Amino acid sequence: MDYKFWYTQPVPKINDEFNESVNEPFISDNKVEDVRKDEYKLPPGYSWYVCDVKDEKDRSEIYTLLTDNYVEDDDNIFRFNYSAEFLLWALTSPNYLKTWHIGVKYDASNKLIGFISAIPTDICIHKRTIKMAEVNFLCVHKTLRSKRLAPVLIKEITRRINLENIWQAIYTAGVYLPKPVSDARYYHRSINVKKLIEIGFSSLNSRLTMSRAIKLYRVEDTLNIKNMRLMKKKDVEGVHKLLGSYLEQFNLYAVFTKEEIAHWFLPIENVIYTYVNEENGKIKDMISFYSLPSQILGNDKYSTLNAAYSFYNVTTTATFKQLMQDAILLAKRNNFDVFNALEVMQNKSVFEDLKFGEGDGSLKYYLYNWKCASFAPAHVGIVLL
Numbered sequence: 001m002d003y004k005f006w007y008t009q010p011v012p013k014i015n016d017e018f019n020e021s022v023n024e025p026f027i028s029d030n031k032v033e034d035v036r037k038d039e040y041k042l043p044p045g046y047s048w049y050v051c052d053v054k055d056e057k058d059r060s061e062i063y064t065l066l067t068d069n070y071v072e073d074d075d076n077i078f079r080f081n082y083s084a085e086f087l088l089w090a091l092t093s094p095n096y097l098k099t100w101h102i103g104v105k106y107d108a109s110n111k112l113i114g115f116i117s118a119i120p121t122d123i124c125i126h127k128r129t130i131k132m133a134e135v136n137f138l139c140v141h142k143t144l145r146s147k148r149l150a151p152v153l154i155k156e157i158t159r160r161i162n163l164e165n166i167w168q169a170i171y172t173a174g175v176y177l178p179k180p181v182s183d184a185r186y187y188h189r190s191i192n193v194k195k196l197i198e199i200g201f202s203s204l205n206s207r208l209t210m211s212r213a214i215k216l217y218r219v220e221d222t223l224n225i226k227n228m229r230l231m232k233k234k235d236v237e238g239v240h241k242l243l244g245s246y247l248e249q250f251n252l253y254a255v256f257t258k259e260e261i262a263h264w265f266l267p268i269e270n271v272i273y274t275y276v277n278e279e280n281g282k283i284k285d286m287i288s289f290y291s292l293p294s295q296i297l298g299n300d301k302y303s304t305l306n307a308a309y310s311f312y313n314v315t316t317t318a319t320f321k322q323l324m325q326d327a328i329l330l331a332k333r334n335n336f337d338v339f340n341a342l343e344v345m346q347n348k349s350v351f352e353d354l355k356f357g358e359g360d361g362s363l364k365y366y367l368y369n370w371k372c373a374s375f376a377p378a379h380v381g382i383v384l385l
């Protein structure tokens with residue numbers, strides 16, 4: 001790979017490493033006054049569009065672009081199918097900017113063919129807290145691939161982020177790019193085993209028959225933490241304390257305000273699930289996971305894999321293993337077929353004993369315009385969407 005676009009940007013080259021003491025921008029003393037005022041040029045017949053994700057129709061257009069053209073697994077059997085209600089939640093966090101929800105239209109048909117987005121958050125990297133954009137949902141239509149549209153989307157969103165005096169960003173990808181700060185394998189825990197077999201997500205052998213696989217993955221419908229219950233507004237201060245305290249141990253994490261705790265954790269059916277254990281008026285344990293279905297490409301019987309993704313889990317009154325066993329059960333009680341997680345935070349410690357299987361790839365975490373030592377994924381304390 002020559003990385004002819006990425007090598008023009010303030011990111012590390014592919015072999016560039018840094019001492020753990022280095023933790024600073026590539027380019028400092030940036031000036032909002034000098035940022036370009038002009039939108040980047042698109043090829044003829046295409047135009048920028050400011051998407052209004054709060055408008056059901058614009059939001060449907062983004063949904064249809066991603067449903068048809070977003071990320072596939074390595075085996076090209078599944079494509080992520082974020083819901084319209086999920087996109088609303090993901091893109092309207094506190095102080096979000098509408099103008100960072102950027103579309104590209106093909107003028108002749110008036111149809112969205114490209115998109116990129118970001119939201120603002122405070123990110124603590126190696127004990128320094130920096131205002132960053134979290135970038136996600138970069139997508140170019142499958143019919144327009146390899147035409148160098150993605151660099152235009154990237155440069156245009158960078159410009160619009162720079163107008164707010166923000167000069168760093170965080171993002172993830174399954175592809176390798178210059179240059180990860182951390183790389184975390186993903187793992188899955190089967191819930192609806194027969195379905196996962198039928199769709200080719202999981203497999204059997206002469207050793208593990210269908211009935212034996214159903215038994216192996218069976219889960220007891222009883223919580224280890226009996227009073228774990230859906231979070232409500234009254235729990236926002238206690239979750240802000242519990243999760244904020246927990247996250248300070250890591251080398252990379254979001255620094256949530258109370259308003260951000262309410263947005264990111266209060267439950268939305270089919271989008272975000274958060275459960276809490278309240279003891280003596282204090283929130284002492286929390287489980288959370290988000291819903292990200294995959295479309296099952298060319299399957300006669302099933303169109304959709306219902307999948308929960310581990311978000312933030314903290315226990316002070318149980319073992320982590322007991323807490324993640326309850327997360328699995330709570331996902332099963334909400335009709336999910338599989339529970340997915342990354343080897344970040346303390347999650348690796350439970351994967352063997354809770355019968356997770358290793359997936360076939362990894363998610364890379366990246367920073368823009370930031371130099372720092374890379375680190376093992378146990379030190380990652382942020383889960384992106």
Ligand SMILES: CCCCCCCCCCCCCC(=O)CSCCNC(=O)CCNC(=O)[C@H](O)C(C)(C)COP(=O)(O)OP(=O)(O)OC[C@H]1O[C@@H](n2cnc3c(N)ncnc32)[C@H](O)[C@@H]1OP(=O)(O)O
Pocket residue numbers: 001002003004005006007069070071072133135136137138139140141144145146147148149150151154157158161162166167168169171172173174175177368369
């Ligand atoms: C201070 C604020 C800063 C804000 C901005 C921060 C940075 C944010 C960066 C964005 C973070 C997004 C995070 C996120 O959304 C989560 S990762 C998921 C990204 N989306 C998909 O994979 C959906 C399906 N694929 C596509 O739509 C296209 O294949 C895309 C659009 C990915 C590339 O379209 P294309 O038609 O295939 O390709 P060209 O247009 O010809 O462009 C080729 C250039 O694109 C580089 N490329 C490929 N995939 C990338 C990826 N995932 N990130 C970054 N760069 C990626 C590639 O290395 C090459 O540059 P190089 O020549 O130097 O190698």
Ligand SMILES: COc1cccc(CC(=N)NC(=O)c2cccnc2OC2CCNCC2)c1
Pocket residue numbers: 071072073074078079080172174186187292294305309340341342363384385
């Ligand atoms: C099963 O359907 C899939 C459809 C598309 C891709 C993948 C593999 C994959 N790339 N999985 C992950 O990236 C992943 C695995 C575990 C936890 N989080 C993840 O990704 C999240 C966070 C980053 N953005 C996408 C969703 C699987």
Ligand SMILES: [Cl-]
Pocket residue numbers: 196197198199200201202203204
């Ligand atoms: Cl199978």
Ligand SMILES: [Cl-]
Pocket residue numbers: 221222223226
């Ligand atoms: Cl129970």
Ligand SMILES: [Cl-]
Pocket residue numbers: 374375376379
């Ligand atoms: Cl390390």
Ligand SMILES: [Mg+2]
Pocket residue numbers: 140144145146147148149150
């Ligand atoms: Mg292109």
